[PDB]
């Protein structure tokens, strides 16, 4: 692990609860859509924070309007663990804030291919 | 507590290699990834697992479980996005 | 309006 360059993963967002404590991460797929996990248990009261590097710049605290939790998600098996969040106010896209592409249903990321993961290591489960 | 945004390059691992690590908990809607030693631990719950598909970063997985502690060397389990895209497309339109 | 193409490139 290592420190990312400031504004290098511009789709990376933090999910803070009403109290302002980072509980989960997220990915901007559009100006008003964020994708995250279902086990996070995201609420309408939670907020999405974009343009963040140092958790401790031009950040955007965005409000959540609609929460689309996958209806096939059970906490026992933890299958279909995904949630899509429609933002109330859209994110102002800039140098440090922008979206990530989503793959097709037919696309494949096979074993051995080097991918990247980012965040502040805060796990819910 | 990492104050700054962390990153880590990790490989995808096969279902068979992930199944021997866990067992019946792994299913077709879960992508595994991690050649461990502090790599999958950087991602938050619901964080991105991004892969370069034709010169552009694509969301392959979403952090689900397995990446709880950096000390454990088992593969990290992510939500296979491609398998969940049919559900995703239904609400985005 | 770009997707997966940051204006600041990631250096792993």
């Amino acid at each position: 692990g290592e420190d990312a360059i400031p504004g290098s993963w511009p789709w990376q967002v933090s999910l803070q609860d009403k109290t302002g404590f980072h509980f989960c991460g997220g990915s901007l797929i559009s100006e008003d859509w964020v994708v995250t996990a279902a086990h996070c248990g995201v609420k309408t009261s939670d907020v999405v924070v974009a343009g963040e590097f140092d958790q401790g710049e031009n950040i955007q605290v965005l409000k959540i309007a609609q929460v689309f939790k996958n209806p096939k998600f059970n906490m026992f098996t933890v299958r279909n663990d995904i949630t899509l969040l429609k933002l109330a106010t859209p994110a102002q896209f800039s140098e440090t804030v922008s979206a990530v592409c989503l793959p097709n249903v037919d696309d494949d990321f096979p074993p051995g291919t080097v991918c990247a993961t980012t965040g502040w290591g805060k796990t819910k489960y | 507590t990492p104050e700054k945004l962390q990153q880590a390059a990790l490989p995808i691992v096969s279902e068979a290699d992930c199944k021997k690590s866990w067992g019946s908990k792994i299913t077709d809607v879960m992508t595994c990834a991690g050649a461990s030693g502090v790599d999958s631990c950087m991602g938050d719950s619901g964080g991105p697992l991004v892969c370069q598909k034709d010169g552009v970063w694509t969301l392959a997985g979403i952090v689900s479980w397995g990446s709880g502690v950096c000390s454990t060397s088992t593969p990290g389990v992510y939500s296979r996005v491609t398998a969940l895209m049919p559900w995703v497309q239904q609400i985005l339109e | 309006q770009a997707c997966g193409v940051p204006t600041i490139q990631p250096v792993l």
Side-chain angles (χ1 to χ4, degrees), chain A residues 1-124:
Chain A
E2 59 175 1
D3 296 326
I5 291 173
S8 174
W9 310 98
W11 51 81
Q12 179 71 48
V13 298
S14 168
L15 309 180
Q16 302 188 157
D17 64 346
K18 61 170 67 170
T19 62
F21 277 90
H22 171 73
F23 70 92
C24 266
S27 304
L28 265 39
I29 58 169
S30 187
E31 76 180 13
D32 48 15
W33 286 105
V34 174
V35 61
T36 187
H39 79 282
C40 289
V42 176
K43 308 172 284 186
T44 317
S45 193
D46 301 341
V47 301
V48 174
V49 185
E52 194 95 63
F53 166 59
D54 197 322
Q55 197 99 310
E57 55 273 319
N58 56 346
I59 68 91
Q60 299 173 38
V61 180
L62 307 175
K63 214 173 287 185
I64 304 179
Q66 304 157 215
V67 180
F68 294 87
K69 185 178 172 184
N70 195 310
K72 311 176 202 187
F73 176 73
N74 298 332
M75 277 287 294
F76 179 65
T77 52
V78 193
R79 304 197 206 93
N80 304 253
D81 188 17
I82 186 168
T83 284
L84 286 165
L85 307 173
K86 178 72 167 186
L87 305 179
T89 49
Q92 285 283 3
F93 274 24
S94 74
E95 293 184 346
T96 54
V97 181
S98 62
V100 68
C101 325
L102 292 165
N104 294 4
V105 67
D106 306 323
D107 288 337
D108 199 5
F109 304 92
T113 54
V114 180
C115 302
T117 185
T118 56
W120 299 272
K122 210 294 189 301
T123 54
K124 204 78 182 298

Side-chain angles (χ1 to χ4, degrees), chain B:
Chain B
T1 321
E3 55 185 317
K4 292 174 164 184
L5 180 59
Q6 301 294 315
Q7 57 172 20
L10 37 59
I12 301 299
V13 299
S14 62
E15 192 181 49
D17 294 323
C18 204
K19 196 177 190 181
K20 63 178 71 170
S21 302
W22 301 106
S24 301
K25 296 178 182 180
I26 303 299
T27 59
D28 56 5
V29 303
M30 301 176 186
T31 310
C32 297
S36 196
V38 184
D39 55 343
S40 56
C41 191
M42 314 321 299
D44 304 288
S45 279
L49 177 63
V50 290
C51 313
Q52 294 276 59
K53 214 305 184 67
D54 291 311
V56 73
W57 292 103
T58 309
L59 187 65
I62 303 174
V63 175
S64 194
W65 53 276
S67 309
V69 294
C70 316
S71 53
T72 301
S73 176
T74 54
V77 183
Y78 304 81
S79 313
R80 188 179 294 276
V81 173
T82 52
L84 299 169
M85 280 301 297
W87 171 86
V88 174
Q89 290 170 199
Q90 281 171 16
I91 72 173
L92 294 172
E93 265 60 32

